Amino acid sequence: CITTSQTGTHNGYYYSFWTNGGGEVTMCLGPGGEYSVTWVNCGDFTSGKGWNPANAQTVTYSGEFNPNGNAYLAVYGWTTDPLVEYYILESYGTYNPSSGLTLLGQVTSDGGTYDIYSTQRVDQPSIEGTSTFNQYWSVRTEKRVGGTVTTANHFAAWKALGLEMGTYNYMIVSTEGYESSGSSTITVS
């Protein structure tokens, strides 16, 4: 298992794990698209499997997401030129990350409806070091764990609202935690 920030490929899938070092955070890689992550009193971390460079994959995923506090389960990724961080948020724990964000519209996809938001992140860690970049959200209006996410429907809906996307960097199904504990296991295809 992995307890320090790391990227690679495992059974043909890209994996990314990032932690600021807080708490214990342990990512365990499995067959095919499987990963698991168990955490206690974390700082901030992201983790999962997918593709890099990605290409707006239709993602299928299943498993279990069990946060105690603030955490997120999302199809998650970056673009470059411009630098963008994005989340198609499927479930989250105690804190709704769109709190305080300006609602841009909706997209319905794969049976669900998602509210769209953008916010500027200032001097935050990123795949280009500490930077300033925009961060896009599709937040599902009801939480779920597992299903198909047609990323291209979200991206098309975001672009139609004036949100610019760069060149695809990685895209994964990320479990992310903020000052919390918990576990999850997700199998990506």
CA 65 to the chain's CA centroid: 13
User: Is the distance from CB of 189 to CB of 79 less than 8 angstroms?
Assistant: no
> What are the backbone dihedrals phi and psi of residue 159, each rounded to the nearest 5 degrees, phi first?
-55, -40
- Type of residue numbered 52: N
Half-sphere CA count of 177, side-chain side, radius 13 A: 32
CATH code reported for the domain at 1-189:
2.60.120.180
Experimental method: X-ray
3-state secondary structure of 107: strand
**Reported resolution in A?**
2.0
3-state secondary structure of 160: helix
Distance CA 10, CA 31 (A): 8
Q: Helices (H), strands (E): how many in the chain?
A: 1, 12
Distance CA 43, CA 45 (A): 7
Q: Which token pair is 31? A: 């067959």
Closest of 63, 82, 21, 43 to residue 173, by C-alpha: 63
Domains of the chain, residue spans: 1-189
Q: What's the chain's length in residues?
A: 189
Residues labelled as active-site residues: 85, 176
- Type of residue numbered 152: A
Q: Supply angle C-alpha 53, 90, 180, rounded to 5.
A: 95
User: Is the distance from CB of 66 to CB of 77 less than 8 angstroms?
Assistant: no
- Cross-strand partners of 48: 16, 174
Closest of 82, 170, 76, 97 to residue 133, by C-alpha: 82
3-state secondary structure of 82: coil
